Scaffold this active site. Structure first.
Site, PDB file in Angstrom:
ATOM      1  N   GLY A 129      35.659  42.685  43.848  1.00  0.00           N
ATOM      2  CA  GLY A 129      35.118  42.120  44.778  1.00  0.00           C
ATOM      3  C   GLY A 129      36.119  42.227  45.835  1.00  0.00           C
ATOM      4  O   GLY A 129      37.252  42.671  45.715  1.00  0.00           O
ATOM      5  N   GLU A 130      35.661  41.479  46.796  1.00  0.00           N
ATOM      6  CA  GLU A 130      36.491  41.340  48.088  1.00  0.00           C
ATOM      7  C   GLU A 130      35.971  40.054  48.706  1.00  0.00           C
ATOM      8  O   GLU A 130      35.109  39.336  48.858  1.00  0.00           O
ATOM      9  CB  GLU A 130      36.420  42.489  48.994  1.00  0.00           C
ATOM     10  CG  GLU A 130      34.926  42.715  49.846  1.00  0.00           C
ATOM     11  CD  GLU A 130      35.015  44.253  50.371  1.00  0.00           C
ATOM     12  OE1 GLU A 130      34.898  45.040  49.691  1.00  0.00           O
ATOM     13  OE2 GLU A 130      35.068  44.238  51.706  1.00  0.00           O
ATOM     14  N   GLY A 131      37.243  39.649  49.653  1.00  0.00           N
ATOM     15  CA  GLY A 131      37.112  38.460  50.679  1.00  0.00           C
ATOM     16  C   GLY A 131      37.657  38.817  52.038  1.00  0.00           C
ATOM     17  O   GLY A 131      37.955  40.052  52.172  1.00  0.00           O
ATOM     18  N   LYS A 150      44.975  40.909  43.939  1.00  0.00           N
ATOM     19  CA  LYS A 150      44.392  40.709  45.218  1.00  0.00           C
ATOM     20  C   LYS A 150      45.584  41.732  46.100  1.00  0.00           C
ATOM     21  O   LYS A 150      46.597  41.379  46.051  1.00  0.00           O
ATOM     22  CB  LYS A 150      44.065  39.464  46.005  1.00  0.00           C
ATOM     23  CG  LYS A 150      43.565  39.501  47.297  1.00  0.00           C
ATOM     24  CD  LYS A 150      43.676  38.126  47.818  1.00  0.00           C
ATOM     25  CE  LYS A 150      42.646  37.547  47.549  1.00  0.00           C
ATOM     26  NZ  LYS A 150      42.125  36.502  48.809  1.00  0.00           N
ATOM     27  N   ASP A 207      38.284  26.563  52.586  1.00  0.00           N
ATOM     28  CA  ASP A 207      37.572  27.699  52.504  1.00  0.00           C
ATOM     29  C   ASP A 207      36.647  27.605  51.164  1.00  0.00           C
ATOM     30  O   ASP A 207      36.665  28.406  50.293  1.00  0.00           O
ATOM     31  CB  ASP A 207      38.711  28.885  52.324  1.00  0.00           C
ATOM     32  CG  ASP A 207      38.027  30.201  52.722  1.00  0.00           C
ATOM     33  OD1 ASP A 207      36.747  30.306  53.166  1.00  0.00           O
ATOM     34  OD2 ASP A 207      38.727  31.181  52.581  1.00  0.00           O
ATOM     35  N   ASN A 264      34.363  31.403  46.426  1.00  0.00           N
ATOM     36  CA  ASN A 264      35.595  31.029  46.081  1.00  0.00           C
ATOM     37  C   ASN A 264      35.717  29.863  44.655  1.00  0.00           C
ATOM     38  O   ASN A 264      36.625  28.969  44.456  1.00  0.00           O
ATOM     39  CB  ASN A 264      36.367  30.339  47.372  1.00  0.00           C
ATOM     40  CG  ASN A 264      36.786  31.596  48.331  1.00  0.00           C
ATOM     41  OD1 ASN A 264      37.214  30.911  49.235  1.00  0.00           O
ATOM     42  ND2 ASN A 264      36.924  32.622  47.980  1.00  0.00           N
ATOM     43  N   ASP A 267      41.565  30.935  46.179  1.00  0.00           N
ATOM     44  CA  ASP A 267      41.700  31.203  47.744  1.00  0.00           C
ATOM     45  C   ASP A 267      42.193  29.940  48.305  1.00  0.00           C
ATOM     46  O   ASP A 267      41.575  29.295  49.027  1.00  0.00           O
ATOM     47  CB  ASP A 267      40.681  31.753  48.367  1.00  0.00           C
ATOM     48  CG  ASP A 267      40.478  33.281  48.300  1.00  0.00           C
ATOM     49  OD1 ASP A 267      41.127  33.946  47.375  1.00  0.00           O
ATOM     50  OD2 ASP A 267      40.215  34.027  49.357  1.00  0.00           O
TER      51      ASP A 267
HETATM   52  C1  LIG Z   1      35.580  39.833  35.592  1.00  0.00           C
HETATM   53  N1  LIG Z   1      34.718  39.795  36.924  1.00  0.00           N
HETATM   54  C2  LIG Z   1      33.417  40.514  37.295  1.00  0.00           C
HETATM   55  N2  LIG Z   1      32.684  40.608  36.269  1.00  0.00           N
HETATM   56  C3  LIG Z   1      31.569  41.600  36.749  1.00  0.00           C
HETATM   57  C4  LIG Z   1      30.285  41.171  36.166  1.00  0.00           C
HETATM   58  O1  LIG Z   1      30.018  40.752  35.074  1.00  0.00           O
HETATM   59  C5  LIG Z   1      30.900  39.691  34.752  1.00  0.00           C
HETATM   60  C6  LIG Z   1      32.530  39.952  35.053  1.00  0.00           C
HETATM   61  N3  LIG Z   1      33.265  40.301  38.385  1.00  0.00           N
HETATM   62  C7  LIG Z   1      34.496  39.626  39.012  1.00  0.00           C
HETATM   63  C8  LIG Z   1      34.743  39.258  40.242  1.00  0.00           C
HETATM   64  C9  LIG Z   1      36.081  38.672  40.754  1.00  0.00           C
HETATM   65  N4  LIG Z   1      36.280  38.058  41.924  1.00  0.00           N
HETATM   66  C10 LIG Z   1      36.575  39.353  42.931  1.00  0.00           C
HETATM   67  C11 LIG Z   1      36.843  38.933  44.592  1.00  0.00           C
HETATM   68  C12 LIG Z   1      35.927  37.905  44.927  1.00  0.00           C
HETATM   69  C13 LIG Z   1      36.278  37.252  46.149  1.00  0.00           C
HETATM   70  O2  LIG Z   1      37.485  36.753  46.291  1.00  0.00           O
HETATM   71  C14 LIG Z   1      35.651  36.513  43.974  1.00  0.00           C
HETATM   72  C15 LIG Z   1      35.337  37.133  42.411  1.00  0.00           C
HETATM   73  C16 LIG Z   1      36.956  38.385  39.563  1.00  0.00           C
HETATM   74  N5  LIG Z   1      38.073  37.730  39.956  1.00  0.00           N
HETATM   75  C17 LIG Z   1      39.139  37.139  39.298  1.00  0.00           C
HETATM   76  O3  LIG Z   1      39.192  37.429  37.852  1.00  0.00           O
HETATM   77  C18 LIG Z   1      40.113  36.536  39.979  1.00  0.00           C
HETATM   78  C19 LIG Z   1      40.828  35.390  39.325  1.00  0.00           C
HETATM   79  N6  LIG Z   1      41.692  34.845  40.152  1.00  0.00           N
HETATM   80  N7  LIG Z   1      41.211  35.295  41.532  1.00  0.00           N
HETATM   81  C20 LIG Z   1      41.662  34.765  42.819  1.00  0.00           C
HETATM   82  C21 LIG Z   1      40.965  35.196  43.904  1.00  0.00           C
HETATM   83  C22 LIG Z   1      39.761  36.164  43.527  1.00  0.00           C
HETATM   84  N8  LIG Z   1      39.462  36.606  42.268  1.00  0.00           N
HETATM   85  C23 LIG Z   1      40.273  36.252  41.257  1.00  0.00           C
HETATM   86  C24 LIG Z   1      36.652  38.681  38.331  1.00  0.00           C
HETATM   87  C25 LIG Z   1      35.326  39.296  38.123  1.00  0.00           C
END
Ligand SMILES: Cn1c(N2CCOCC2)nc2cc(N3CCC(CO)CC3)c(NC(=O)c3cnn4cccnc34)cc21
Ligand SMILES: [Ca+2]
EC number: 2.7.11.1
Length: 292
Positions: free
Chosen positions: A31-33, A51, A149, A154, A167
């Site tokens: 994903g993205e922010g 990130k 934020d 988040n 974040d």
């Molecule tokens: C495994 N997974 C999955 N799946 C696919 C669908 O089926 C379930 C598992 N989608 C995820 C999305 C995110 N993020 C992306 C950035 C976004 C915008 O910032 C937010 C969601 C994460 N992210 C993290 O693990 C993470 C851990 N610390 N962290 C800090 C900032 C942003 N992301 C993270 C995992 C995902």
């Protein structure tokens, strides 16, 4: 604290060169922010989230570097089960990366939209996530930090759907002060935050919008929807033209009218247009505990 300083090239390897294809399709992109794209990787048998910082909203390269330093500083001070944990970073060359503990269930935003075909969250799980997210905000406020934020993108979810606030690049140590740089996601922002004020009272307001997304399963903003802003349903309900029942997410079979109305009442209070009339986070936390 002990954060591992990686070389950029190591993170280039773990993320398969920041492979832009979605993870749903075998790529690395999650994903993205506004401050960068987040990728999956494996470091020494550990699944991680990486990130790669980038000014994707209207901020300067210097502001992006201050946000990087700020996030590290906040993460070094703040550890709690409802906060994301930072593992490392890279700052060699002209690139900035943050490495976190991987969250197997991604964001609350994506789980509410059932992005990638994940099953709809039950009302019981939605209540625990609301409680968890409030415990995270409470920890930050108790520790003299304003998040700035707060939004469902988040709020992350681990293997047991424990809410993890993420974040911290805009976070500020906390008397209401003003800023000349208005940064954030409009659909979640309190009126005073939109005017440049900095106060923990705005965190509560944004949490109010999150509570509405949890109940309804609707995004905070949708340009092809009437009303475009989810926060506007509060006025529709108050003017008695609608009820929370008309908006409850239909993708659940375990929502009882009593706890839904109790969650809405918390959301309505967080959404008070006058900052001084909103509950503080300890009160939000007590009300969500009484609801269950
Ligand atoms: C495994 N997974 C999955 N799946 C696919 C669908 O089926 C379930 C598992 N989608 C995820 C999305 C995110 N993020 C992306 C950035 C976004 C915008 O910032 C937010 C969601 C994460 N992210 C993290 O693990 C993470 C851990 N610390 N962290 C800090 C900032 C942003 N992301 C993270 C995992 C995902
Ligand atoms: Ca081994």
């Amino acid at each position: 604290t002990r954060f591992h300083s990686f070389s950029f090239y190591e993170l280039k390897n773990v993320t398969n060169n920041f492979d832009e294809r979605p993870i749903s399709v075998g790529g690395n992109k999650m994903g993205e922010g506004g401050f960068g794209v987040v990728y999956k990787g494996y470091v020494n048998n550990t699944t991680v989230a990486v990130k790669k910082l980038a000014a994707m909203v209207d901020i300067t390269t210097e502001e992006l570097k201050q946000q990087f330093d700020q996030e590290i500083k906040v993460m070094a001070k703040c550890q709690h089960e409802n906060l994301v944990e930072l593992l490392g970073f890279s700052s060699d060359g002209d690139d900035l990366c943050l490495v976190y503990v991987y969250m197997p269930n991604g964001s609350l935003l994506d789980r509410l939209s059932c992005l990638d075909g994940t099953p709809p969250l039950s009302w019981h799980m939605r209540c625990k996530i609301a409680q968890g997210a409030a415990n995270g905000i409470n920890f930050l406020h108790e520790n003299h930090h304003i998040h700035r934020d707060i939004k469902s993108a988040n709020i992350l979810l681990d293997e047991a759907f424990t809410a993890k606030i993420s974040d911290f690049g805009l976070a500020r140590a906390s008397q209401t002060v003003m800023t000349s740089r208005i940064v954030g996601t409009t659909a979640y922002m309190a009126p005073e935050a939109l005017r440049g004020e900095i106060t923990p009272k705005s965190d509560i307001y944004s949490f109010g919008v999150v509570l509405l997304e949890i109940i309804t399963g609707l995004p905070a903003v949708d340009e092809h929807r009437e009303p475009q802003l989810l926060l506007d349903i509060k006025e529709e309900i108050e003017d008695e033209e609608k009820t929370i029942e008309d908006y409850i997410d239909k993708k659940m079979n375990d929502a009882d009218s009593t706890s839904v109305e109790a969650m809405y009442s918390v959301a309505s209070q967080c959404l008070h247009e006058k900052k001084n009339k909103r509950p503080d986070i300890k009160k939000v936390q007590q009300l969500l505990q009484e609801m269950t």
